[PDB]
Amino acid sequence: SLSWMQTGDTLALSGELDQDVLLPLWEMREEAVKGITCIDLSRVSRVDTGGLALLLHLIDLAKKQGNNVTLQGVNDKVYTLAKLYNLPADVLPR
Template identity: 35%
Template sequence: MSNWSIDAGVICFSGVLDRFTVPDLWASLSSWKPTEKGYLVDLSRVERVDSAGMVMLIHLLEHAKTENCHIMLSFVPKDLGTLFRLSNVDKLLAKHIQN
């Protein structure tokens, strides 16, 4: 199970971001309209992420960009970082990852 919430410029994901949970998450995220110029996406409570979760986060970055909003990913799980590298998107996402 996974969940997301927004509070004071922070988007927090929790649980699992995988091919089973992403469709429902994206259904709600795709209609989200940012009200801030930037958001921090807190991934510290994500238990597991697969390639579907990675793609959803990339789509979220692009969705925000079309709304003139910049997103920074924080507490990126090790397995997600590995997926970024294996997919050769790590350099493209470098400006969106908070160390």
């Protein structure tokens, strides 16, 4: 499951993040982002490579209409994959 919520200005996410549950959340890419400024990483249990890339896409097109999105709640598995694929600052700042 990839249930997700909003606060009106901040996108929430819950459930697990796999490469088999992410396709309906790809269908929401313009009503999903609403001038978002933060991303919770609240109830993630596993992160996958494409689910990281889906995470990487949502922050990126949250530019040019919205805010510079802050990050929090990371379970320190994504930071392992961060320097692994040596992702730059301007696509993923913390």
